[PDB]
């Protein structure tokens, strides 16, 4: 078991593992950090530039069979780390202090679950192994502090000018609702809240944007160093048209569109367990390839998800072992990988 | 059986019939047109100032028992007529030529089924016994001609300047989509389409408005002789907030708000038959009394209703004997009665 021959065997095995989060195989990512041989057990330490906790489990169950087969180990001791990479933005627009990446979440009008996707994406990204925050920028409907229960709280001012973020459910949070308003005036107060908030070491910062593609939304996509955008829609035709507009809006500002999330794809009868595409099917998939982007994931419509939206504890935290949390965790892996595969590391 | 004693007995019986469409009993409406006695059968002819076909059936089954009891008739020969009354509008804003009343249908943003309610209200109003048309004014999403199949058709110009309406499913129809656009320019072309269209003897004219409460929507509620408005919402909180805005918008223009229609109140599993309030419950009822107006009706969310919206034949025509059509027919009676009980006849 030569340590250089061990690395060659391990890297030669990980090079075949395929996954929706892997545009190219793992050897592309230089992730193979360490390969050792202690007490007849083969140690493999992997350091990914984006979150990969759930996908890392699939790698273990698929490759350990052959990894034990070519090596001579009683077992394999895996280990997953994360050094989240800061991706370069267009025009080198100065990024936010303490914020590596900014994943924007936008939609067209309400009723699509944009804000529901924002809180759970942020919690899933943190659950997948990153330092995550979330800025509620939805001026029309500041609903993030309510979804987290931090509605009755207010941020403190350590620097007098700067604001200390509310650490809700482990996320560094702040909201425009803590200050309540249309036109360029709303964009200014929303902007400086991003600068004046003392974000910690946020590898990711989910930005719940105001819905629509007006001048105030476009002003946000211009002056905010958005690393990537995630458009949210329902299989309804009226929502897909708005998603078509949002993708166009972000493209015309050179902000990378990570993909589309199809909320309320099907409804799950709480008694029958039957899945009913009450709003259509495949409409989001059609828009994904029509604009050369991915369909990052789908999310059903279920009564338990709406109930979690009223109790002030999002589903990723309330039901950490549910299918819905497992879907949100997959979305985080799918999103953070797409944020990486599109750009270049700094 | 003195004919004056017959009328007293009939009017004294109809004076007790109670119904959600009757703010005051039938004797208020002077509707008792004729009471006769031919071949031992009692004839009763009723002429209502608003549509009442479905409610007229309830009057027959409830009152014929006692009507035969106080009279001496082998049976009762009912007869329902309609002389739809033109209600006076605020500031005496000159009404549209050939259009007695204008029932506006508005909402906040899309996904609430505003346009689905508009076509079926118009068809139900006609099914309930009136001459009805419908003008698609939704500039953002002209979806009425598609819902009727008259999408590929275009109006003809009899007077060169004036337009002949497309007689789709017996309705006098016209759409802004036949011309395709924001700002005061959109309000002008939309306005003159209402004047230049040669509406026949439209007792009612459903106006499918653009969603929202912006300046262009408010300009429409000002310059159009709207006799009444019907706000559409879903039990979602985001839609109810928009309904709260629309009611306020119409009130500040002295346009009577007829009430609220709660679309997608519950979802009906096509297998379980189970009703699931996926978007909440009672939110629309709360807004109704908070603004001193009626809850004109509720409408479930079912796959067959969405399918009727793609096949180009609305549910009132496609499934004339379904529960959903029976609900739309009740809504017409509820709406047209509310349009009457609020104002004064010309
Ligand atoms: Mg919101
Ligand atoms: Mg429409």
């Amino acid at each position: 078991k030569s340590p250089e021959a061990l690395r060659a065997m391990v890297a030669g095995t990980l090079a075949n593992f395929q996954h929706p989060t892997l545009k190219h195989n793992l050897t592309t990512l230089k992730a193979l950090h360490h390969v050792a041989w202690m007490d007849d057990t083969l140690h493999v330490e992997l350091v990914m530039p984006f979150v990969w906790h759930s996908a890392f489990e699939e790698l273990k169950e698929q490759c350990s069979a052959e990894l034990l087969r070519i090596t001579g180990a009683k077992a394999i001791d895996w280990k997953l780390s994360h050094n989240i990479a800061t991706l370069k933005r267009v025009k080198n627009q100065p990024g936010i202090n303490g914020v590596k990446n900014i994943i924007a979440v936008s939609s067209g009008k309400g009723g699509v679950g944009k804000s529901s996707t924002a809180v759970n994406l942020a919690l899933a990204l943190a659950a997948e192994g990153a330092k995550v925050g979330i800025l509620d920028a939805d001026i029309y409907g500041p609903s993030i502090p309510t979804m987290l229960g931090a509605e009755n709280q207010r941020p403190t001012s350590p620097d007098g000018t700067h604001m200390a973020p509310i650490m809700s459910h482990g996320l560094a949070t702040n909201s425009i609702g803590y200050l309540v308003w249309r036109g360029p005036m709303a964009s200014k107060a929303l902007m400086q809240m991003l600068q004046e908030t003392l974000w910690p070491d946020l590898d990711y910062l989910v930005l719940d944007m105001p819905p629509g593609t007006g001048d105030i939304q476009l002003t946000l996509a211009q002056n905010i160093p958005v690393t990537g955008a995630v458009v949210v829609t329902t299989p309804q035709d009226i929502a897909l048209i708005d998603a078509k507009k949002g993708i166009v809006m972000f493209e015309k500002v050179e902000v990378p569109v990570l993909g589309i999330v199809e909320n309320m794809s099907v409804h799950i009868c709480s008694n029958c367990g039957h899945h009913e595409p009450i709003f259509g099917t495949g409409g989001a998939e059609k828009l994904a390839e029509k604009y050369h982007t991915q369909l990052l994931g789908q999310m059903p419509l279920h009564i338990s998800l709406r109930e979690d939206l009223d109790k002030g504890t999002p589903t990723v935290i309330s039901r950490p072992e549910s299918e819905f949390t497992a879907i949100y965790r997959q979305l985080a892996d799918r999103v953070a990988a797409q944020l990486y595969w599109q750009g270049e590391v700094i």
Side-chain angles (χ1 to χ4, degrees), chain A residues 53-73 75-87 90 92 94-108 110-180 183-200 202-303:
Chain A
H53 184 267
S54 299
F56 189 76
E57 297 292 314
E58 280 178 277
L59 171 72
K60 299 193 291 183
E61 57 133 13
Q62 295 186 8
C63 296
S64 297
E66 39 182 336
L67 256 175
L68 289 173
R69 170 181 310 160
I70 87 189
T71 334
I76 297 168
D77 184 292
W78 300 86
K79 169 178 171 58
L80 176 61
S81 314
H82 292 103
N83 173 73
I84 310 303
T86 310
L87 292 120
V90 273
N92 313 134
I96 310 304
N97 323 334
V99 177
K100 294 183 185 174
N101 300 307
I102 295 182
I103 303 174
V105 186
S106 184
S107 71
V112 291
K114 167 188 65 69
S115 305
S116 324
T117 306
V119 277
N120 296 290
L121 214 215
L123 292 162
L125 279 172
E128 288 306 279
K131 267 251 67 59
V132 184
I134 172 177
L135 193 157
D136 174 56
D138 194 350
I139 300 248
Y140 314 134
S143 59
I144 298 297
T146 299
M147 285 183 182
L148 284 176
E151 39 191 312
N152 301 316
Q153 282 63 54
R154 287 303 189 277
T156 111
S157 240
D159 311 2
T161 316
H162 298 174
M163 292 179 297
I166 299 181
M167 304 306 301
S168 185
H169 294 85
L171 298 181
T173 66
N174 202 340
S175 175
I176 193 64
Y178 294 149
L179 310 170
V180 189
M185 51 139 294
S187 301
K188 171 63 67 177
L190 197 161
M191 268 288 306
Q192 51 199 179
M193 176 173 50
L194 179 52
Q195 267 91 348
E196 283 141 16
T197 306
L198 290 179
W199 310 108
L202 298 193
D203 313 322
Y204 303 98
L205 173 56
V206 181
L207 175 68
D208 189 8
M209 265 187 53
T213 58
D215 295 333
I216 163 175
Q217 296 91 330
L218 211 163
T219 308
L220 264 33
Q222 288 260 351
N223 308 330
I224 298 179
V226 181
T227 309
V230 181
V231 181
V232 181
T233 183
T234 61
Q236 311 177 6
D237 269 82
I238 182 56
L240 287 162
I241 294 174
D242 297 327
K244 179 184 177 182
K245 292 202 187 67
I247 301 170
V248 169
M249 190 196 72
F250 286 109
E251 284 185 354
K252 300 174 75 175
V253 199
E254 291 165 313
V255 169
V257 174
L258 302 191
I260 307 176
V261 172
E262 186 180 35
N263 282 338
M264 309 182 186
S265 58
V266 292
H267 176 267
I268 308 180
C269 175
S270 298
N271 289 329
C272 202
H274 160 62
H275 296 211
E276 182 171 340
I278 193 65
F279 297 141
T281 23
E285 177 63 37
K286 283 176 169 291
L287 186 65
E289 49 180 294
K290 180 180 165 63
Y291 281 80
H292 306 74
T293 192
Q294 288 294 332
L295 189 58
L296 305 174
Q298 302 167 277
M299 175 67 52
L301 180 60
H302 197 253
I303 188 67

Side-chain angles (χ1 to χ4, degrees), chain A residues 119-120 123 144-151 168-169 304-320 325:
Chain A
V119 277
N120 296 290
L123 292 162
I144 298 297
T146 299
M147 285 183 182
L148 284 176
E151 39 191 312
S168 185
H169 294 85
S304 54
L305 297 174
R306 310 292 295 187
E307 293 170 350
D308 291 339
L309 291 179
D310 298 341
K311 301 194 299 179
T313 312
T315 301
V316 174
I317 303 296
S318 308
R319 320 181 199 270
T325 293

